[model samples]
Target: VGSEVSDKRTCVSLTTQRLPVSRIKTYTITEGSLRAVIFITKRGLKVCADPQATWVRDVVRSMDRKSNTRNNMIQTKPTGTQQSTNTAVTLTG
Candidate 1:
């Protein structure tokens, strides 16, 4: 009986593996039932998960950090100029 359950679990896990991580387009969390949904593609796949699940929260947190890093990179600017080239020209009559 234990072997049968393990086999079924493995099969289910394998099915999701067919969808590569890069294919996932977006992830949304709905608070009502504490549910989260990962939208894989426009019409291909979707994964529903519990928002409180450790794995789900970890993935969301990772994406958040990446977004924050990207935003910080975009808004950062150089503080000062390193060198100045100013030349004075003199004219004598």
Candidate 2:
């Protein structure tokens, strides 16, 4: 795990109107402790954030909301998707 340092990148710049911390958590490799904090960005960049960069804290805090919101959206295709599926099914029928 410590041998290869290529997969998990590091954070550099930390301010953006765009959701700074990526809500997309693909794995837990960087969570427990990676010698530093790595924050994923919407741009798919793993950035190492300074602990004081509470900037990341705030944005990072908000990312939880983002995941829930994302969950709602994922569940949403329910009604809308069923409608579309019906369209195809009925059309094909």
Candidate 3:
């Protein structure tokens, strides 16, 4: 017999406002049969969770992977010459 109750739904929203921060912090928690993944950003907190348990774990893992990937991203800075453009025109009568 296969008689079990389960729910499969995901929700997201802005949980906080902008705040002073230099980096993003992430964490997780388990309460009874519920699980959650929380992401703390300079702007605020982003929480993703589900009663499915594994769902939240998977989500948090994915977020960590992506975050690490982005941290390793290459950044380039422009030189003074590339920072500005100038044009000149001369007219004769």
Candidate 4:
């Protein structure tokens, strides 16, 4: 949170870069502080996806739920102490 990204930080290529949700890491840029940029993965693979892409959005939808927060991921608590089939797309903004 100091002064590393003094220059605009963003990935270059924009496409649907397939990634595992568990590998997503939010570096020095915490949750709400980041936007207009694709997410970064653990270690060194910074993913620069076209946030507008179909696959990328879906992946984001999945990632947000995993608490690798891109913004406010409105996670749901399934009733009955069990998570069964989920046909719901969570609310995230």
TM-score of each: 0.36, 0.37, 0.29, 0.42
What is the clash tally of candidate 2? Answer: 4
lDDT per residue (tens digit) for residues 1-93 in model 2: 334465634544433334434544321124454544455544455555544556656665665666656645654244534333333334554
Residues 1-93, candidate 1: write the lDDT tens digits. Answer: 343454441122312333333454445556654344453333444555555555556666664554445445655367865888999999998
The TM-score-based order of candidates, best leading, equals 4, 2, 1, 3
Estimate, for each residue in 2-54, the C-alpha lDDT of model 4 and write its tens digit. Answer: 53464645655554556676787542222453444466675666756555566
- Which segments of model 2 are wrong by more than 4 Å? 1-35, 69-93
Candidate 3 whole-model C-alpha lDDT, 0 to 1:
0.47
* Per-prediction tally of clashes: 0, 4, 0, 0
TM-score, model 4 to reference:
0.42
lDDT of each: 0.48, 0.47, 0.47, 0.57
Q: Please write out the lDDT profile of model 3 over residues 3-88, one tens digit for every residue.
A: 33355222253223222223444444556444544555534444444524554446456657656655457344677654657989
Ranking by lDDT: 4, 1, 2, 3
Model 4 is weakest, by summed lDDT over 10 consecutive residues, at: 27-36
**Residue 90, candidate 1: how far off, in angstroms?**
87
Lowest summed lDDT across 10 adjacent residues in model 2 is found at 24-33
**Candidate 4, pairs of clashing residues:** none
